[PDB]
Write a protein that binds this ligand. Structure first.
Ligand code: HEC
Length: 108
């Protein structure tokens, strides 16, 4: 027990200003700089087809759940050195919570 639920509305706007530049979240949403993340929970890293991911991400083979997604979110290059994900992070657990509450919801 280490992840508690945030606000999806607050999650959704965090997403629009911090992740939209690179990702789509809708079913059948296209890949961009970053891959489409629909269905990410339960899935492992580097398995969306039609996307060229770094060695590092495939290699890490992380099961995508809220718990994991939080630490990746804090510092991705940290969590997975070699990732091409150019994002500093979300150091605030509160923001992280909203946002994950949002992804838990839309990538559904
Ligand atoms: C572009 C400047 C990005 C921003 C901003 C965010 N992400 Fe991203 N993401 C990007 C890339 C290029 C990649 C590929 C990684 C590689 O090393 O090949 C990723 C990857 C992810 C993943 C992992 C998914 C998988 O298929 O295993 C996740 C869960 C992810 N990105 C989520 C995410 C969120 C929620 C963001 C906003 C806070 C975000 N990323 C920022 C590109 C970019």
């Amino acid at each position: 027990t280490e992840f508690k639920a945030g606000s999806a509305k607050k999650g959704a706007t965090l997403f629009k200003t911090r992740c939209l530049q690179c990702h789509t979240v809708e079913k059948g949403g296209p890949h961009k700089v970053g891959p489409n993340l629909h269905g990410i929970f339960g899935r492992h890293s580097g398995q969306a087809e039609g996307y060229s991911y770094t060695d590092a991400i495939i290699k890490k083979n992380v099961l995508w759940d809220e718990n994991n997604m939080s630490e990746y979110l804090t510092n991705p290059k940290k969590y997975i050195p070699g990732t091409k994900m150019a994002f500093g992070g979300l150091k605030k657990e509160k923001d992280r919570n909203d946002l994950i509450t949002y992804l838990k919801k839309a990538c559904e």
